[PDB]
Design a protein around this nucleic acid. Structure first.
Ligand SMILES: [Mn+2]
Ligand SMILES: [Mn+2]
Ligand SMILES: [Mn+2]
Ligand SMILES: [Mn+2]
Ligand code: NA
Length: 344
DNA sequence: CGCTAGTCGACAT
DNA sequence: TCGACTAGCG
């Protein structure tokens, strides 16, 4: 959701081929592939007609990784995150709008236009993802459903040393503190890598290459958890953090118009939103696959009360988190759609 | 120049 | 699940 982030830090990126990670473990932001896969068969998906074309699309990529001796872990988005509800609403509204329009264009005969609308009405469901999971597993590929956003789960797997890199199209994964992200990776393995440790290569960040400041910059520029103040993008957010001296980020935001020589009113709820968004990048719940439990992405500090962090994912019993992670529990019916047992 | 909001692009015949 | 582009605005 950090619009314009990749161009802005392009200096820190390197063209690569995934051969680099041969014999290592890479995690995949699989909903990216799913959304790409679904475009080919949008019409049938919109009409409710049966399709599994998207499964073969994802499997091309999976197969390619395996051929180069990469051990992929496919990660899937799970339950809805309240911090993202506004964005979830606008996406839902847009899908609905386009689906209706396509249908009306079918009673018109304009199949060309109707196709353009359907393709923008695509909704990726757990049922669709679960078909990819079965395909993957049958080829011995580890799959994991995040309890909430795949984003934080990926970050967690990268930070824990479980995977060495993350394949995704979402550059905001860097604000979650991923070490290595591989973007724009094509079907042949060519892609664009950004390492957190090379963010200092990026001249226009100044000293906003440190984890905490980089996160603040991303949030300030406007992210999925929190719309920016009007007139603030990456460059001005970066500028505020460069020029600001005070460590207390709240006191800096309150006087943000000062650092920028702009008339910017900062509403009281914006500070609250900013804190919430910060806490969401930091403490969004993930599933530790080794101990098989729900944990915050980072350990709680001595400044956060975990009781107040519902918006970052509510805890559920670990036995339930397990069934979700294995893909057994449908997200929504919360009923068993499968009974895969990794032990046996 | 930097930011915004709208648009449109991803598939693959 | 997202990103790239662009014309217009300050
Ligand atoms: Mn849940
Ligand atoms: Mn979703
Ligand atoms: Mn994201
Ligand atoms: Mn995501
Ligand atoms: Na912004």
């Amino acid at each position: 959701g950090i619009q314009g982030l990749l161009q802005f830090i392009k200096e820190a990126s390197e063209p690569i081929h995934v051969r680099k990670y041969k014999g290592q473990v890479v995690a995949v932001d699989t909903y990216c592939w799913l959304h790409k896969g679904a475009i080919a068969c949008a019409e049938k998906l919109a009409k409710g007609e049966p399709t599994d074309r998207y499964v073969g699309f994802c499997m091309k990529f999976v197969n390619m990784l395996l051929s180069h001796g990469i051990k992929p872990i496919l990660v899937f988005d799970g339950c809805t995150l309240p911090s993202k509800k506004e964005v979830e609403r606008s996406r839902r509204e847009r899908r609905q709008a386009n689906l209706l329009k396509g249908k009306q264009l079918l009673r018109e005969g304009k199949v060309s236009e109707a196709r353009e609308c359907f393709t923008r009405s695509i909704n990726i469901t757990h049922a669709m993802a679960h078909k990819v999971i079965k395909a993957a597993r049958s080829q011995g590929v580890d799959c994991l459903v995040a309890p909430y956003e795949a984003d934080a789960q990926l970050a967690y797997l990268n930070k824990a040393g479980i995977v060495q890199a993350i394949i995704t199209e979402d550059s905001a994964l860097l604000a979650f503190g991923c070490k290595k992200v591989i973007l724009k990776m094509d079907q042949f393995g060519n892609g664009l890598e950004i390492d957190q440790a090379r963010l200092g290569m990026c001249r226009q960040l100044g000293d906003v290459f440190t984890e905490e400041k980089f996160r603040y910059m991303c949030i300030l520029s406007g992210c999925d958890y929190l719309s920016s103040l009007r007139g603030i993008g990456l460059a001005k957010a970066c500028k505020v953090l460069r020029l600001a001296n005070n460590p207390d980020i709240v006191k800096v935001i309150k006087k943000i118009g000062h650092y920028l020589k702009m008339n910017i009113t900062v509403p009281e709820d914006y500070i609250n939103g900013f804190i919430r968004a910060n806490n969401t990048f930091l403490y969004q719940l993930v599933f530790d696959p080794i101990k098989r439990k729900l944990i915050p992405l980072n350990a709680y500090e001595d400044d956060v009360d975990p009781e107040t962090l519902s918006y970052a994912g509510q805890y559920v019993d670990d036995s339930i988190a397990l069934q979700i992670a294995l893909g057994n529990k449908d997200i929504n019916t919360f009923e068993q759609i499968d009974d895969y047992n990794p032990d046996t």
